Amino acid sequence: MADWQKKLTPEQFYVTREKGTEAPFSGMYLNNKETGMYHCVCCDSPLFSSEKKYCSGTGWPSFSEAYGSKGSDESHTGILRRLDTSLGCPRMEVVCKQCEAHLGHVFPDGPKPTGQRFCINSVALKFKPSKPAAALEHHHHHH
Ligand SMILES: [Zn+2]
């Protein structure tokens, strides 16, 4: 509103359309994509490793697990969850409670739930890479 910028490059209105599709002329998506992780820009916490990114199929924003934490960590994470099988067919969906970010979901492909695909949408999420000269996480300094 009151603009041309946000109309030519929408954000909250764009990612909500990308919540179902791939696109050609991918540009910045036509090169390599490194290892790393993803975190909120709404709360505090890093939550998903790019290590589980569905590469060598589509490279698209999916995560073959929500990978970094286990068992003990299901209270620590500040993430929550909600299942739905009520249309006669089972779905699984997940939220961060810290940010209230309801952005991660996992759906079957037709066979057993062993074939599932876990899609996550970046509408309030940022990322940090694995490799240095863009990773620089701890201090490097002296006396
Ligand atoms: Zn969060």
Side-chain angles (χ1 to χ4, degrees):
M1 286 71 179
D3 76 292
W4 291 65
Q5 291 66 28
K6 229 77 183 184
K7 280 171 179 194
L8 290 171
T9 176
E11 294 173 333
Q12 204 191 111
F13 218 86
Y14 190 18
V15 181
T16 41
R17 180 57 156 224
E18 305 299 72
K19 289 204 81 187
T21 199
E22 182 265 18
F25 195 73
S26 335
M28 263 180 71
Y29 230 131
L30 290 174
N31 66 350
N32 193 22
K33 281 290 106 63
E34 229 174 82
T35 304
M37 61 160 61
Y38 305 78
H39 65 92
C40 305
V41 71
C42 195
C43 54
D44 277 311
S45 38
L47 240 304
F48 316 117
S49 310
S50 213
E51 235 226 50
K52 267 60 260 280
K53 189 71 126 72
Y54 281 78
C55 199
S56 47
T58 332
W60 189 92
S62 279
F63 295 83
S64 57
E65 292 198 89
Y67 193 87
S69 52
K70 223 73 235 283
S72 278
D73 308 329
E74 292 188 345
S75 189
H76 201 340
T77 30
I79 76 188
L80 251 76
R81 36 251 172 206
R82 217 298 191 82
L83 282 60
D84 182 12
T85 195
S86 333
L87 305 182
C89 196
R91 302 306 182 262
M92 247 195 294
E93 189 162 73
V94 306
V95 315
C96 166
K97 183 263 167 174
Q98 311 209 274
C99 31
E100 295 167 51
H102 47 275
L103 308 182
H105 6 69
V106 58
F107 314 140
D109 61 328
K112 268 58 73 89
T114 41
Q116 273 175 123
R117 50 269 168 75
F118 197 146
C119 48
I120 308 185
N121 85 99
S122 316
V123 74
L125 308 179
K126 284 226 71 195
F127 45 80
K128 305 183 190 192
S130 238
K131 311 309 302 191
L136 189 54
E137 209 248 74
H138 66 65
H139 73 271
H140 72 98
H141 323 136
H142 218 241
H143 47 226

Short mmCIF file of all heavy atoms in Angstrom, two decimals, residues 71-134:
data_model
loop_
_atom_site.label_atom_id
_atom_site.label_comp_id
_atom_site.label_asym_id
_atom_site.label_seq_id
_atom_site.Cartn_x
_atom_site.Cartn_y
_atom_site.Cartn_z
N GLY A 71 14.24 -35.83 21.54
CA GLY A 71 13.69 -36.50 22.72
C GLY A 71 13.56 -35.60 23.94
O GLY A 71 12.51 -35.02 24.20
N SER A 72 14.68 -35.44 24.64
CA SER A 72 14.86 -34.46 25.70
C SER A 72 14.54 -33.04 25.23
O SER A 72 14.07 -32.21 26.00
CB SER A 72 16.32 -34.49 26.10
OG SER A 72 16.56 -35.56 27.01
N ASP A 73 14.76 -32.78 23.94
CA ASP A 73 14.72 -31.43 23.39
C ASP A 73 13.33 -30.99 22.93
O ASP A 73 13.12 -29.85 22.52
CB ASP A 73 15.73 -31.33 22.24
CG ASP A 73 17.15 -31.78 22.56
OD1 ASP A 73 17.61 -31.65 23.72
OD2 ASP A 73 17.83 -32.25 21.62
N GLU A 74 12.34 -31.87 23.05
CA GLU A 74 10.96 -31.65 22.59
C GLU A 74 10.16 -30.70 23.49
O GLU A 74 9.12 -30.19 23.08
CB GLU A 74 10.22 -32.97 22.44
CG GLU A 74 10.77 -33.81 21.28
CD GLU A 74 9.94 -35.06 20.98
OE1 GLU A 74 9.09 -35.46 21.81
OE2 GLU A 74 10.16 -35.63 19.89
N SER A 75 10.68 -30.44 24.69
CA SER A 75 10.28 -29.33 25.56
C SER A 75 11.19 -28.11 25.38
O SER A 75 10.73 -26.97 25.38
CB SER A 75 10.28 -29.79 27.02
OG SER A 75 9.69 -28.81 27.85
N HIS A 76 12.50 -28.33 25.15
CA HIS A 76 13.48 -27.23 25.10
C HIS A 76 13.31 -26.32 23.89
O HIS A 76 13.44 -25.10 24.00
CB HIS A 76 14.91 -27.79 25.12
CG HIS A 76 15.94 -26.78 25.56
ND1 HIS A 76 15.81 -25.40 25.56
CD2 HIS A 76 17.20 -27.04 26.03
CE1 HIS A 76 16.94 -24.86 26.04
NE2 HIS A 76 17.82 -25.82 26.35
N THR A 77 12.98 -26.93 22.76
CA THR A 77 12.83 -26.32 21.42
C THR A 77 11.84 -25.16 21.39
O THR A 77 11.99 -24.25 20.59
CB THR A 77 12.34 -27.35 20.40
OG1 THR A 77 11.52 -28.34 20.98
CG2 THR A 77 13.49 -28.05 19.68
N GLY A 78 10.80 -25.25 22.21
CA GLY A 78 9.69 -24.31 22.17
C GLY A 78 8.81 -24.49 20.93
O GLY A 78 8.03 -23.59 20.62
N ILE A 79 8.93 -25.63 20.23
CA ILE A 79 8.03 -25.97 19.12
C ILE A 79 6.89 -26.88 19.59
O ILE A 79 7.04 -27.70 20.50
CB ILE A 79 8.78 -26.53 17.88
CG1 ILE A 79 9.22 -27.98 18.12
CG2 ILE A 79 9.90 -25.57 17.45
CD1 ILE A 79 10.14 -28.58 17.05
N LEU A 80 5.76 -26.73 18.92
CA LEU A 80 4.49 -27.42 19.12
C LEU A 80 4.01 -28.05 17.79
O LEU A 80 4.64 -27.91 16.74
CB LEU A 80 3.46 -26.44 19.71
CG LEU A 80 3.13 -26.73 21.17
CD1 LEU A 80 4.23 -26.28 22.14
CD2 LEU A 80 1.83 -26.03 21.55
N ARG A 81 2.92 -28.81 17.86
CA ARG A 81 2.46 -29.70 16.79
C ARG A 81 0.97 -29.99 16.90
O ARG A 81 0.37 -29.86 17.96
CB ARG A 81 3.29 -31.00 16.79
CG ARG A 81 3.71 -31.51 18.18
CD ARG A 81 5.22 -31.31 18.39
NE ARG A 81 5.62 -31.62 19.78
CZ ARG A 81 6.67 -31.12 20.43
NH1 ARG A 81 7.68 -30.61 19.81
NH2 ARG A 81 6.73 -31.14 21.73
N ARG A 82 0.39 -30.37 15.76
CA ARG A 82 -1.04 -30.62 15.56
C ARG A 82 -1.25 -31.49 14.31
O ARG A 82 -0.86 -31.15 13.21
CB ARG A 82 -1.81 -29.29 15.46
CG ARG A 82 -3.20 -29.34 16.12
CD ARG A 82 -4.14 -30.35 15.46
NE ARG A 82 -5.53 -30.20 15.94
CZ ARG A 82 -6.44 -29.35 15.52
NH1 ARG A 82 -6.22 -28.49 14.57
NH2 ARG A 82 -7.60 -29.33 16.09
N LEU A 83 -1.89 -32.63 14.52
CA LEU A 83 -2.28 -33.59 13.50
C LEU A 83 -3.75 -33.41 13.07
O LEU A 83 -4.59 -32.98 13.86
CB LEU A 83 -2.06 -35.01 14.02
CG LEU A 83 -0.63 -35.56 14.02
CD1 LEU A 83 0.36 -34.76 14.87
CD2 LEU A 83 -0.64 -37.00 14.54
N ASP A 84 -4.05 -33.83 11.85
CA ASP A 84 -5.39 -33.76 11.25
C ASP A 84 -5.60 -34.94 10.29
O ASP A 84 -4.97 -35.00 9.23
CB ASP A 84 -5.56 -32.41 10.53
CG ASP A 84 -6.95 -32.22 9.91
OD1 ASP A 84 -7.88 -33.01 10.22
OD2 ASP A 84 -7.13 -31.23 9.17
N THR A 85 -6.47 -35.88 10.64
CA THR A 85 -6.87 -37.02 9.77
C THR A 85 -8.37 -37.03 9.44
O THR A 85 -8.99 -38.03 9.08
CB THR A 85 -6.33 -38.34 10.36
OG1 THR A 85 -6.41 -39.37 9.40
CG2 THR A 85 -7.05 -38.81 11.62
N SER A 86 -8.98 -35.86 9.60
CA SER A 86 -10.41 -35.69 9.87
C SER A 86 -11.27 -35.52 8.62
O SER A 86 -12.47 -35.76 8.61
CB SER A 86 -10.61 -34.54 10.86
OG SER A 86 -9.49 -34.34 11.71
N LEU A 87 -10.58 -35.24 7.52
CA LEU A 87 -11.09 -35.29 6.15
C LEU A 87 -11.01 -36.70 5.54
O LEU A 87 -11.21 -36.87 4.34
CB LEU A 87 -10.44 -34.20 5.29
CG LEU A 87 -10.58 -32.77 5.83
CD1 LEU A 87 -9.92 -31.77 4.87
CD2 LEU A 87 -12.03 -32.35 6.04
N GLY A 88 -10.71 -37.69 6.38
CA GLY A 88 -10.55 -39.10 6.01
C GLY A 88 -9.12 -39.51 5.65
O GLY A 88 -8.86 -40.68 5.39
N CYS A 89 -8.21 -38.54 5.59
CA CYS A 89 -6.81 -38.74 5.18
C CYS A 89 -5.83 -37.97 6.10
O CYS A 89 -6.04 -36.78 6.31
CB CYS A 89 -6.71 -38.29 3.71
SG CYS A 89 -5.18 -38.92 2.95
N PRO A 90 -4.77 -38.61 6.64
CA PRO A 90 -3.91 -38.00 7.67
C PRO A 90 -2.89 -36.99 7.13
O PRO A 90 -2.18 -37.25 6.15
CB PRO A 90 -3.20 -39.18 8.35
CG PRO A 90 -3.13 -40.24 7.25
CD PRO A 90 -4.44 -40.02 6.49
N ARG A 91 -2.79 -35.86 7.82
CA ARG A 91 -1.82 -34.76 7.70
C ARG A 91 -1.19 -34.47 9.07
O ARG A 91 -1.78 -34.76 10.12
CB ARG A 91 -2.52 -33.50 7.15
CG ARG A 91 -3.19 -33.72 5.79
CD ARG A 91 -2.18 -34.28 4.78
NE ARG A 91 -2.77 -34.46 3.43
CZ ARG A 91 -3.22 -35.61 2.95
NH1 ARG A 91 -3.11 -36.73 3.59
NH2 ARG A 91 -3.81 -35.66 1.79
N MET A 92 -0.01 -33.87 9.07
CA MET A 92 0.77 -33.48 10.23
C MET A 92 1.26 -32.05 10.03
O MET A 92 1.79 -31.71 8.97
CB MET A 92 1.98 -34.42 10.39
CG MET A 92 1.94 -35.31 11.63
SD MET A 92 3.51 -36.10 12.06
CE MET A 92 3.74 -37.20 10.64
N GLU A 93 1.11 -31.20 11.04
CA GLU A 93 1.58 -29.81 10.98
C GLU A 93 2.22 -29.36 12.31
O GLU A 93 1.91 -29.88 13.39
CB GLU A 93 0.42 -28.94 10.46
CG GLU A 93 0.77 -27.49 10.12
CD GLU A 93 -0.32 -26.87 9.21
OE1 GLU A 93 -1.44 -26.59 9.69
OE2 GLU A 93 -0.08 -26.74 7.98
N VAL A 94 3.20 -28.45 12.23
CA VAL A 94 4.05 -28.02 13.35
C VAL A 94 4.20 -26.50 13.41
O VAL A 94 4.13 -25.79 12.40
CB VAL A 94 5.44 -28.71 13.35
CG1 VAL A 94 5.32 -30.24 13.31
CG2 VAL A 94 6.38 -28.30 12.22
N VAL A 95 4.40 -25.99 14.62
CA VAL A 95 4.54 -24.55 14.89
C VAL A 95 5.72 -24.32 15.83
O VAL A 95 6.04 -25.18 16.64
CB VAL A 95 3.24 -23.94 15.46
CG1 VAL A 95 1.98 -24.40 14.71
CG2 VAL A 95 2.99 -24.26 16.94
N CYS A 96 6.32 -23.14 15.79
CA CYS A 96 7.11 -22.61 16.85
C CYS A 96 6.15 -21.77 17.71
O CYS A 96 5.36 -20.96 17.23
CB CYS A 96 8.26 -21.84 16.20
SG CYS A 96 9.08 -20.81 17.44
N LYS A 97 6.19 -22.07 19.00
CA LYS A 97 5.46 -21.35 20.05
C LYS A 97 6.22 -20.10 20.53
O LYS A 97 5.58 -19.17 21.02
CB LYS A 97 5.08 -22.33 21.17
CG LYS A 97 4.24 -21.68 22.28
CD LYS A 97 5.10 -21.26 23.49
CE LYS A 97 4.25 -20.34 24.37
NZ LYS A 97 4.94 -20.00 25.63
N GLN A 98 7.54 -20.05 20.38
CA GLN A 98 8.36 -18.92 20.78
C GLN A 98 8.05 -17.65 19.97
O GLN A 98 7.91 -16.57 20.53
CB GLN A 98 9.87 -19.24 20.69
CG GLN A 98 10.26 -20.55 21.38
CD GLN A 98 11.70 -20.49 21.89
OE1 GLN A 98 12.66 -20.76 21.19
NE2 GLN A 98 11.89 -20.07 23.13
N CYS A 99 7.90 -17.83 18.66
CA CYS A 99 7.58 -16.83 17.66
C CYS A 99 6.09 -16.83 17.25
O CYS A 99 5.62 -15.87 16.64
CB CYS A 99 8.53 -17.08 16.48
SG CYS A 99 9.01 -18.81 16.23
N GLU A 100 5.37 -17.91 17.60
CA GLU A 100 4.02 -18.26 17.13
C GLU A 100 3.98 -18.55 15.61
O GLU A 100 2.93 -18.44 14.95
CB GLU A 100 2.96 -17.30 17.70
CG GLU A 100 2.89 -17.47 19.23
CD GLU A 100 2.12 -16.36 19.94
OE1 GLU A 100 0.97 -16.07 19.52
OE2 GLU A 100 2.62 -15.83 20.95
N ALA A 101 5.13 -18.95 15.05
CA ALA A 101 5.37 -19.23 13.64
C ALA A 101 4.90 -20.63 13.22
O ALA A 101 5.59 -21.64 13.36
CB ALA A 101 6.85 -18.96 13.37
N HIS A 102 3.71 -20.69 12.63
CA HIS A 102 3.05 -21.91 12.15
C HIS A 102 3.42 -22.26 10.70
O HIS A 102 2.62 -22.08 9.77
CB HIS A 102 1.54 -21.75 12.41
CG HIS A 102 0.97 -20.41 11.98
ND1 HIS A 102 0.97 -19.25 12.72
CD2 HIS A 102 0.40 -20.13 10.77
CE1 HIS A 102 0.39 -18.29 11.98
NE2 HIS A 102 0.04 -18.77 10.77
N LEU A 103 4.68 -22.66 10.48
CA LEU A 103 5.34 -22.60 9.16
C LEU A 103 5.89 -23.90 8.57
O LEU A 103 6.39 -23.91 7.44
CB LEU A 103 6.47 -21.57 9.20
CG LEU A 103 6.12 -20.18 9.72
CD1 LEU A 103 7.38 -19.33 9.62
CD2 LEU A 103 4.97 -19.51 8.96
N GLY A 104 5.83 -24.97 9.35
CA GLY A 104 6.33 -26.30 9.04
C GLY A 104 5.21 -27.33 8.98
O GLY A 104 4.32 -27.36 9.83
N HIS A 105 5.24 -28.19 7.97
CA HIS A 105 4.18 -29.15 7.68
C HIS A 105 4.73 -30.39 6.99
O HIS A 105 5.73 -30.33 6.27
CB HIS A 105 3.08 -28.51 6.82
CG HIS A 105 3.37 -27.10 6.34
ND1 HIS A 105 4.31 -26.74 5.42
CD2 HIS A 105 2.92 -25.96 6.93
CE1 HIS A 105 4.45 -25.41 5.45
NE2 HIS A 105 3.60 -24.88 6.35
N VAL A 106 4.05 -31.52 7.16
CA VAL A 106 4.46 -32.80 6.57
C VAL A 106 3.28 -33.66 6.13
O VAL A 106 2.35 -33.94 6.89
CB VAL A 106 5.49 -33.54 7.45
CG1 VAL A 106 5.02 -33.84 8.87
CG2 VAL A 106 5.96 -34.86 6.83
N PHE A 107 3.31 -34.06 4.86
CA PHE A 107 2.20 -34.71 4.15
C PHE A 107 2.66 -36.00 3.43
O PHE A 107 3.78 -36.05 2.91
CB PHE A 107 1.57 -33.72 3.15
CG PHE A 107 1.28 -32.30 3.62
CD1 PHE A 107 1.53 -31.22 2.76
CD2 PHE A 107 0.75 -32.04 4.91
CE1 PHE A 107 1.28 -29.90 3.17
CE2 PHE A 107 0.51 -30.72 5.33
CZ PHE A 107 0.77 -29.65 4.46
N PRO A 108 1.81 -37.05 3.36
CA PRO A 108 2.11 -38.28 2.63
C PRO A 108 2.06 -38.07 1.10
O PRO A 108 1.60 -37.05 0.60
CB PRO A 108 1.07 -39.29 3.11
CG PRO A 108 -0.14 -38.42 3.43
CD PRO A 108 0.49 -37.14 3.98
N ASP A 109 2.57 -39.06 0.36
CA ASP A 109 2.69 -39.07 -1.10
C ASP A 109 1.74 -40.04 -1.83
O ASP A 109 1.59 -39.98 -3.05
CB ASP A 109 4.17 -39.32 -1.47
CG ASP A 109 4.74 -40.65 -0.96
OD1 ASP A 109 4.30 -41.12 0.12
OD2 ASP A 109 5.66 -41.19 -1.63
N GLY A 110 1.05 -40.88 -1.07
CA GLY A 110 0.17 -41.95 -1.56
C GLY A 110 0.34 -43.30 -0.82
O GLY A 110 -0.65 -43.81 -0.30
N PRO A 111 1.55 -43.89 -0.77
CA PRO A 111 1.86 -45.10 0.01
C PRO A 111 1.89 -44.85 1.54
O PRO A 111 1.25 -43.93 2.07
CB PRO A 111 3.19 -45.60 -0.59
CG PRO A 111 3.89 -44.32 -1.02
CD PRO A 111 2.71 -43.51 -1.57
N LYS A 112 2.59 -45.72 2.28
CA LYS A 112 2.83 -45.63 3.73
C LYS A 112 3.49 -44.29 4.11
O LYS A 112 4.21 -43.72 3.29
CB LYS A 112 3.70 -46.82 4.19
CG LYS A 112 2.90 -48.06 4.65
CD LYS A 112 1.93 -48.67 3.63
CE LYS A 112 2.73 -49.39 2.54
NZ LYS A 112 2.99 -50.81 2.87
N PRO A 113 3.33 -43.80 5.36
CA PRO A 113 3.91 -42.54 5.82
C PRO A 113 5.45 -42.50 5.78
O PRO A 113 6.05 -41.44 5.95
CB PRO A 113 3.36 -42.33 7.24
CG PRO A 113 3.08 -43.75 7.72
CD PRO A 113 2.59 -44.44 6.45
N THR A 114 6.11 -43.63 5.50
CA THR A 114 7.53 -43.70 5.14
C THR A 114 7.90 -42.86 3.90
O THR A 114 9.04 -42.41 3.82
CB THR A 114 7.91 -45.17 4.87
OG1 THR A 114 6.87 -45.82 4.15
CG2 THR A 114 8.09 -45.95 6.17
N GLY A 115 6.97 -42.61 2.98
CA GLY A 115 7.16 -41.77 1.78
C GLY A 115 6.94 -40.26 1.97
O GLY A 115 6.99 -39.50 1.00
N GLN A 116 6.68 -39.81 3.20
CA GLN A 116 6.32 -38.42 3.52
C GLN A 116 7.30 -37.35 3.01
O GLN A 116 8.52 -37.56 2.96
CB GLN A 116 6.11 -38.26 5.03
CG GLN A 116 4.66 -38.60 5.37
CD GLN A 116 4.40 -38.57 6.86
OE1 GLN A 116 3.55 -37.86 7.36
NE2 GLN A 116 5.10 -39.38 7.60
N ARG A 117 6.77 -36.16 2.71
CA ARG A 117 7.54 -34.95 2.39
C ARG A 117 7.20 -33.81 3.36
O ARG A 117 6.03 -33.48 3.56
CB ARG A 117 7.42 -34.55 0.91
CG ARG A 117 5.98 -34.46 0.37
CD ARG A 117 5.49 -35.79 -0.24
NE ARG A 117 4.04 -35.76 -0.49
CZ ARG A 117 3.41 -35.14 -1.46
NH1 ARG A 117 4.02 -34.45 -2.38
NH2 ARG A 117 2.12 -35.18 -1.52
N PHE A 118 8.24 -33.24 3.96
CA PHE A 118 8.15 -32.20 4.99
C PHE A 118 8.58 -30.86 4.40
O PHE A 118 9.77 -30.60 4.21
CB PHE A 118 9.02 -32.64 6.18
CG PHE A 118 8.84 -31.98 7.54
CD1 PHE A 118 9.04 -32.76 8.70
CD2 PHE A 118 8.49 -30.62 7.69
CE1 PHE A 118 8.87 -32.21 9.98
CE2 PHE A 118 8.32 -30.07 8.97
CZ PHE A 118 8.50 -30.86 10.12
N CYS A 119 7.60 -30.01 4.11
CA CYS A 119 7.72 -28.67 3.54
C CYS A 119 7.78 -27.61 4.66
O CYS A 119 7.00 -27.67 5.61
CB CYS A 119 6.57 -28.46 2.54
SG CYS A 119 4.95 -28.93 3.20
N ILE A 120 8.67 -26.61 4.55
CA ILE A 120 8.76 -25.50 5.52
C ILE A 120 8.87 -24.18 4.76
O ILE A 120 9.63 -24.08 3.80
CB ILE A 120 9.91 -25.70 6.53
CG1 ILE A 120 9.86 -27.09 7.21
CG2 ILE A 120 9.92 -24.56 7.58
CD1 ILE A 120 10.89 -27.32 8.32
N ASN A 121 8.10 -23.16 5.16
CA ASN A 121 8.00 -21.90 4.42
C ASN A 121 8.66 -20.70 5.13
O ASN A 121 8.45 -20.47 6.32
CB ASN A 121 6.54 -21.65 3.99
CG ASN A 121 5.68 -20.97 5.03
OD1 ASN A 121 5.46 -19.77 4.97
ND2 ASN A 121 5.09 -21.71 5.94
N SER A 122 9.46 -19.93 4.40
CA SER A 122 10.41 -18.95 4.96
C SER A 122 9.82 -17.59 5.35
O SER A 122 10.58 -16.63 5.51
CB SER A 122 11.59 -18.75 4.00
OG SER A 122 12.04 -19.99 3.48
N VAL A 123 8.50 -17.45 5.48
CA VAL A 123 7.80 -16.13 5.53
C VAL A 123 8.25 -15.22 6.68
O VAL A 123 8.12 -14.00 6.59
CB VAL A 123 6.28 -16.35 5.55
CG1 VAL A 123 5.76 -16.86 6.89
CG2 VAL A 123 5.51 -15.10 5.13
N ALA A 124 8.78 -15.82 7.74
CA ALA A 124 9.37 -15.15 8.91
C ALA A 124 10.74 -15.75 9.34
O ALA A 124 11.13 -15.62 10.50
CB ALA A 124 8.34 -15.15 10.04
N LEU A 125 11.45 -16.44 8.43
CA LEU A 125 12.65 -17.22 8.74
C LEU A 125 13.89 -16.77 7.95
O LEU A 125 13.83 -16.49 6.75
CB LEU A 125 12.40 -18.72 8.50
CG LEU A 125 11.16 -19.35 9.16
CD1 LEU A 125 11.07 -20.83 8.78
CD2 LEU A 125 11.20 -19.26 10.68
N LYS A 126 15.03 -16.76 8.63
CA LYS A 126 16.39 -16.49 8.13
C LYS A 126 17.30 -17.71 8.25
O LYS A 126 16.88 -18.80 8.64
CB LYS A 126 16.90 -15.27 8.90
CG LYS A 126 16.21 -14.02 8.33
CD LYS A 126 17.22 -12.91 8.10
CE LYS A 126 18.12 -13.27 6.90
NZ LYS A 126 19.33 -12.42 6.87
N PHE A 127 18.54 -17.57 7.78
CA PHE A 127 19.47 -18.67 7.56
C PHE A 127 20.93 -18.24 7.73
O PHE A 127 21.29 -17.11 7.42
CB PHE A 127 19.21 -19.25 6.16
CG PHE A 127 19.03 -18.21 5.06
CD1 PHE A 127 20.15 -17.59 4.47
CD2 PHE A 127 17.74 -17.82 4.67
CE1 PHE A 127 19.98 -16.57 3.51
CE2 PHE A 127 17.56 -16.80 3.71
CZ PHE A 127 18.68 -16.18 3.13
N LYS A 128 21.78 -19.17 8.19
CA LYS A 128 23.24 -19.01 8.32
C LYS A 128 23.95 -20.23 7.69
O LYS A 128 23.50 -21.36 7.93
CB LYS A 128 23.62 -18.77 9.80
CG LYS A 128 22.85 -17.59 10.42
CD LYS A 128 23.24 -17.28 11.87
CE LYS A 128 22.25 -16.26 12.48
NZ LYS A 128 22.69 -15.70 13.78
N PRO A 129 25.00 -20.06 6.86
CA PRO A 129 25.63 -21.16 6.13
C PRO A 129 26.61 -21.97 6.99
O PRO A 129 26.93 -21.60 8.12
CB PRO A 129 26.35 -20.49 4.95
CG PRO A 129 26.75 -19.14 5.52
CD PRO A 129 25.59 -18.79 6.46
N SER A 130 27.09 -23.09 6.45
CA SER A 130 28.02 -24.00 7.13
C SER A 130 29.47 -23.53 7.05
O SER A 130 30.23 -23.67 8.01
CB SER A 130 27.92 -25.39 6.54
OG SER A 130 27.57 -26.35 7.51
N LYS A 131 29.88 -23.06 5.86
CA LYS A 131 31.28 -22.82 5.51
C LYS A 131 31.74 -21.36 5.79
O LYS A 131 30.92 -20.44 5.69
CB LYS A 131 31.56 -23.27 4.07
CG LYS A 131 31.08 -24.69 3.70
CD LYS A 131 31.49 -25.84 4.63
CE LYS A 131 33.00 -26.00 4.81
NZ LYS A 131 33.31 -27.27 5.50
N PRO A 132 33.02 -21.14 6.15
CA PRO A 132 33.56 -19.82 6.53
C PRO A 132 33.60 -18.79 5.39
O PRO A 132 33.27 -19.08 4.25
CB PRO A 132 34.95 -20.08 7.12
CG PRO A 132 35.38 -21.40 6.49
CD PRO A 132 34.06 -22.15 6.33
N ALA A 133 33.98 -17.56 5.75
CA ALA A 133 33.84 -16.31 4.97
C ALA A 133 32.38 -15.87 4.70
O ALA A 133 32.13 -14.82 4.09
CB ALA A 133 34.72 -16.34 3.71
N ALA A 134 31.42 -16.61 5.25
CA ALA A 134 30.04 -16.23 5.47
C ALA A 134 29.54 -16.75 6.83
O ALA A 134 28.86 -16.02 7.56
CB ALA A 134 29.18 -16.70 4.29
#
